[PDB]
Design a protein around this ligand. Structure first.
Ligand SMILES: C[S@@+](CC[C@H](N)C(=O)[O-])C[C@H]1O[C@@H](n2cnc3c(N)ncnc32)[C@H](O)[C@@H]1O
Ligand SMILES: C[S@@+](CC[C@H](N)C(=O)[O-])C[C@H]1O[C@@H](n2cnc3c(N)ncnc32)[C@H](O)[C@@H]1O
Lengths: 259, 52, 262, 52
């Protein structure tokens, strides 16, 4: 058996790479994690032998640690590989961006002596740059998971574009809920206020998943984040609060200046 | 029904995408979408579309 | 006329999105910036009406500000749009990542009242995560242009995966050269030593452009960077210098401790 | 022509890609690559490939 993890991008049908589509077509079996029923139907038409990973999320109001869901997904995938199947895992976006299942499955497959690889796809941030007309290289880019930003020591560079992923579950420490609370978001606001003014304009971004759908590009002051309507798919963009300043020490060593 | 078929085509066909962007309603009607479905598209109600 | 800018990804033929391929197929005219002759031939077979933007680069040993090249590229694209053509720009990778020609053309097109949009593609960074088996979310991710990192005060978070793009021209201020010098790279090493030990392992990464080609994944100590063979396509990956540590301040505000984390 | 045609197909066809991965030399030989072309591939010399 063998494993190839591919991404389907965010938009229905057209945002998958040509080669990745081919991998799905030729697979013995496909394990999917897709945004909606339209993408699910598209996939099943491409290859009918699909196992929907969604089943491993908490189903009936059960309390379930997300780590357990992911482990069960990985085990499902590996079972197909172990049994001898040419296995493809088709995840929305890029299968290795803010996604542990593919990396975990690839690590485990290799450890067990199976061929395993990841094909890149178009991620949410790839969509953001295009939709907002922002180049990550303009003043730089930084990405963190929102909860990780809260629970561990991270320092943003406020001259860059900062992305906080999984904002809808920011500070939800149990990994057992699909949303957080306004109180937690307020703590995040106060934390961010170390670098960003309370009136600093931030952007709640949601890339469209359907061709008839416009992206969500909602501008609001940071202070208002705790009252905002957030979805699992929301990413928070925090544009620069500070202009670039000259690195005089290095400029002098290079023998140059602003001019 | 026709919703899924239409959205899949539109998503991967640049000619249809360009036609759609020129005249959304006409293209949707040409693909048999109901008035209700078209209204959901134009009001950006993704939840309604999913139910339809 | 109208403008759509698409990316072709890094790998030949297969890494373009289905929709983006369709845009190229149906275009009146295509302006291209592609990695090699194989991709150029692939494009020409998709759509024979191609103008190669590479022509606007300094051909001779002439000195030419890259900003001037970009201006001429943008002007060529807009001339087609203004004339009435359904114009597509096909750029390698993602057309809007560490790339200015598409953003500039789109801005100008919109200002002149033309339809213009960018379609995301697969960037070098996207390829890196896959090839190295690294998730940007694992401990965070920062990306900077190498020269900008040197010229301006950027402050890395050494728990993250740090990418320095355009490492081969690090510190080259004129924008008239294809590469920098050892001296400039040594200055960068000393700068980075603020946060990273000299023996810190860094990675020179080059995504493959052909299906029969392996990526470059060259691991070396930071100290050795100035002696490295760098190419225009090289990206420098600086893995974390430090493990994640608990933010007791914020945990306290949340009313929890480390043991409570799921 | 042949070299380029092969690389273009290999790059987008997952069946051919998997066949190639299983037996690079056999697949390259069968698609008409010369010994010198195959050598360049196996030694990873992209410059020589381009010349060819
Ligand atoms: C488990 S990660 C999935 C990321 C996915 N692998 C990718 O390539 O974008 C989930 C997070 O990705 C981001 N995300 C997912 N879908 C998104 C969308 N449609 N628009 C914006 N961000 C999105 C959000 O930060 C969300 O909380
Ligand atoms: C002008 S930017 C173009 C980036 C391109 N738009 C993308 O999406 O990757 C050029 C820089 O991108 C990176 N890059 C381009 N091709 C690459 C490759 N094959 N492997 C790694 N990095 C690459 C390098 O940092 C290089 O200096």
């Amino acid at each position: 058996g063998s494993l190839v993890c591919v991404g389907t991008g965010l938009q229905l049908a057209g945002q998958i790479s040509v080669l990745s589509r081919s991998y799905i077509e030729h697979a013995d079996i496909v394990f999917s994690l897709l945004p909606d029923g339209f993408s699910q139907r598209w996939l099943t038409k491409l290859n009918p032998n699909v196992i929907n990973l969604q089943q491993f999320y908490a189903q009936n109001g059960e309390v379930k640690n997300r780590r357990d869901t992911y482990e069960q997904m990985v085990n499902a995938i590996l079972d197909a590989v172990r049994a001898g199947k040419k296995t493809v895992c088709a995840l929305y976006g890029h299968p290795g961006v803010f996604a542990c299942v593919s990396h975990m499955a690839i690590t485990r497959a290799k450890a067990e002596g199976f061929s395993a690889k990841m094909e890149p796809g178009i991620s949410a941030e790839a969509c953001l740059w295009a939709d907002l007309g922002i180049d990550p290289g303009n003043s730089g880019h930084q990405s963190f998971e929102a909860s990780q930003f809260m629970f561990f020591n991270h320092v943003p560079d406020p001259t860059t574009h900062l992305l906080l992923w999984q904002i809808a579950i920011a500070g939800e420490h149990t990994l057992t809920q699909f949303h957080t609370s306004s109180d937690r978001l307020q703590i995040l606001v106060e934390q961010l206020n170390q670098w960003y003014p309370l009136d600093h304009e931030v952007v709640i971004y949601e890339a469209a998943n359907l061709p008839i759908q416009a992206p969500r590009i909602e501008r609001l002051p940071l202070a208002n984040l705790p009252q905002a309507h957030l979805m699992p798919i929301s990413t928070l963009l925090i544009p620069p609060a500070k202009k670039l300043e000259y690195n005089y020490a290095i400029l002098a060593k290079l023998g140059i200046g602003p001019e | 029904s026709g919703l899924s078929d239409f959205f899949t085509q539109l998503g991967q066909d640049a000619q249809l995408m360009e036609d759609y962007k020129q005249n959304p309603e006409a293209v949707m009607r040409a693909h048999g979408l109901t008035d209700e479905q078209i209204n959901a598209v134009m009001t950006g109600d993704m939840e309604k579309l999913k139910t339809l």
